[PDB]
């Protein structure tokens, strides 16, 4: 059982918030009934449903922030790339490709020609 992720994504934040506070309610009363019956595996689906809603709530919030910071430098660090420490510090392909005027003229004038040795 439990709530599925895809149909939650069609909701809004207030509906999700109402869903969450409702979800936390039964987990309370399932927990008090857990000590009554010898076993109750139904609580597992309840807790997972809370996680699914919480992920959905977070997912919507970040995307709206991403749209807010779209198209301008200095985005929040957690929304940046998490490749490595080294790669983030590495030279970008633009700056690595930069070359002085003296060398650019030599490359354009004298590139490595394609030659064949048969005759």
């Amino acid at each position: 059982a439990g709530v599925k992720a895809y149909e939650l994504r069609t909701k809004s934040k207030e509906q999700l918030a109402s869903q969450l506070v409702d979800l936390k309610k039964e987990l309370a009363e399932l927990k008090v009934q857990k000590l009554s019956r010898p076993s109750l595996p139904k609580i597992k689906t309840v807790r997972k449903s809370i996680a699914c809603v919480l992920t959905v709530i977070n997912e919507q919030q970040r995307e709206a922030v991403r749209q807010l910071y779209k198209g301008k430098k200095y985005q929040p660090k957690d929304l940046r790339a998490k490749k490595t420490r080294a790669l983030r510090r590495a030279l970008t392909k633009f700056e690595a490709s930069q070359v002085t005027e003296k060398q650019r003229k030599k490359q354009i004038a004298f590139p490595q020609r394609k030659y064949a040795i048969k005759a």
């Binding site: 008090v32 857990k34 922030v65 929304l79």
Partner: protein, 121 residues
Amino acid sequence: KALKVRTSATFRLPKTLKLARAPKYASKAVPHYNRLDSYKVIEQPITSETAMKKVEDGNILVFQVSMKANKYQIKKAVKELYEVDVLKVNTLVRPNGTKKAYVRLTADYDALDIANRIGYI
């Protein structure tokens, strides 16, 4: 021309204007949801026969509470979830590592009536 009059042979660092932080971007840009919710500070009552004695006799409720919660939160949460005023709160750390809360309700309310309303008696 003239010099500033100094009436103290000790020189101290001048007071300069201090700016206020105006970050170009937010730190995390998504504020964390409330870490310690009323549903998280209290999770389940304690149904030991000794605990049941306090409920029926002393008008005292018993709960297991998160170790991060203090008496202010416990009193705040109980009157929230159960809409019942709290006289005083006693807390202790059980030998198994969990926190046990002794909540005493005002005489205007009955602990036994609240207990079975929760679903245990």
